């Protein structure tokens, strides 16, 4: 059965063949890549991901502060695309948002807030999967530019994630503050995850992907909380096309 990675590799092959014929024989950007040979190991989420078999302790038996630290670390690993220790990236069939299962051992309020973050973990997992998929030049120019901008925003998000991880490590953070700090950031992450998922599902490329981005930034229009990121991404994506 085809997984989202296998589907994307077959799509890459067919799109290379298509551009080969549509260009009448003109050159195509082709490079050797081992990124697809082990994507789940490079901070992304692929069908086959999980939690951590080497970091697994009873969070309930752990004190509240220890549980919080462990959950923050697992959350931040999910928000960087890799699995957690108590938050496990679940396998995905077809290219969709990467789901993250929370261990049921967490406290009701703790597990509540873990699930609240989990939107961020799924957003980052899907973001890094799209980032490392379009990171290689097989799809269109707009696709590669979008991947570049998306991975830039993911790297800034991960700088923030590591700062928050350290602050939680010293016990200077709460789930409410975690949810509050990156509200525009998480808005942008959700918007860009929706854009990326629409690109992946409809295999948009070229002006198709450009139309996807324009519709993404035009469906809301006016007044902004996280559309700055989407507008910057759309400009960079259309830079080769422009």
């Amino acid at each position: 059965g085809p997984t989202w990675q296998q589907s994307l590799e077959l799509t890459r092959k067919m799109l290379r063949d298509k551009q080969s014929k549509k260009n009448s024989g003109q050159r195509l950007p082709v490079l050797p890549a081992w990124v697809y040979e082990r994507p789940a190991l490079l901070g992304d989420f692929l069908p086959g991901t999980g939690g951590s078999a080497d970091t697994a302790v009873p969070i309930g038996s752990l004190p509240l502060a220890s549980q919080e630290a462990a959950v923050v670390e697992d959350l931040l690993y999910v928000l960087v695309g890799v699995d957690g220790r108590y938050i496990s990236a679940q396998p995905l069939t077809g290219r969709q948002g990467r789901t993250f299962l929370v261990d049921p051992n967490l406290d009701l309020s703790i597990r509540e807030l873990v699930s609240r973050i989990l939107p961020v973990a799924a957003s980052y997992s899907t973001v890094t999967r799209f980032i490392e998929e379009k990171s290689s030049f097989e799809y269109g120019q707009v696709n590669h530019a979008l991947a570049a901008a998306m991975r830039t925003l993911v790297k800034e998000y991960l700088v923030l994630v590591t700062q928050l991880e350290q602050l939680q490590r010293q016990g200077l953070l709460s789930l409410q503050k975690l949810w509050f700090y990156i509200q525009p950031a998480m808005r942008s992450l959700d918007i860009l995850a929706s854009l990326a998922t629409s690109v992946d599902k409809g295999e948009c490329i070229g002006g198709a992907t450009l139309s996807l981005l324009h519709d993404r930034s035009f469906s809301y229009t006016g007044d902004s909380q996280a559309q700055e990121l989407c507008l910057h991404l759309t400009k960079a994506a259309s830079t080769p096309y422009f």
Partner: protein, 214 residues
């Protein structure tokens, strides 16, 4: 003494109290659970828009009596407002919503600013009153929760009136340009608790998409 009086009443009633949380948790731990419920994460004895305790006598729904459940009750009496606040903050937490709340930039601005104030309320609680008795927690948060309850009647679920209008998920509360209408009459018709600066800011941000379009 409280337990003994309640025992006398339960003897005369046939044991119709059954101590929903006879004692718990402590001061600082009960405060922590209540502050979590006010943030919007239901307390370990409290569900948001759901009875915290399985006692229906005012000892367990009780500002206090030292009675079995009354320790939970002091929290519960104020808690029902906090549960409403939590569901209202969920209602206004995302700037976009299905059905009568999709599309609308003024609606997104309004919902985002409300979520901003809900977040500020939730960070004020369990950051000002860590390890404060229930009485202090309730007294400090009364002047905030009353404004929240007024806005809950103004806004969505988190209230005994869903939205403004009705008390069910079919409330007349507008959205989008319909909301840019709705809010002007809601703003004139009521601003009588604490919404004058807040309603002014809300009207400004709701007009920002309208002013953009115009």
């Amino acid at each position: 003494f409280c337990r003994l009086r309640q025992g006398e009443l339960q003897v005369l009633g046939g044991a119709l109290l059954q101590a929903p949380q006879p004692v718990l948790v402590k001061e600082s731990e009960l405060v922590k659970d209540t502050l979590n419920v006010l943030l919007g994460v239901v307390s370990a004895t409290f569900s948001l828009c759901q009875p915290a305790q399985a006692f229906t006598v005012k000892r367990g729904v009780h500002v206090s009596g030292a009675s079995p459940e009354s320790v939970s009750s002091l929290l519960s009496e104020v808690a029902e407002c906090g549960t409403h606040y939590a569901r209202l903050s969920d209602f206004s937490l995302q700037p976009v919503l299905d059905s009568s709340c999709s599309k609308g930039l003024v609606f997104q601005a309004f919902t985002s600013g409300l979520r901003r104030y809900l977040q500020y309320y939730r960070a004020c609680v369990l950051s000002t009153p860590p390890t404060l008795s229930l009485l202090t927690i309730g007294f400090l948060f009364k002047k905030l929760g009353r404004q929240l309850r007024y806005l809950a009647e103004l806004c969505g679920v988190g209230t005994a009136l869903p939205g403004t209008g009705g008390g069910e998920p079919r409330a007349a509360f507008p959205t989008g340009v319909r909301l840019l209408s709705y809010l002007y009459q809601e703003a004139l018709d009521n601003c009588s608790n604490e919404h004058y600066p807040v309603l002014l800011s809300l009207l400004k941000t709701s007009c920002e998409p309208y002013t953009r379009f115009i």
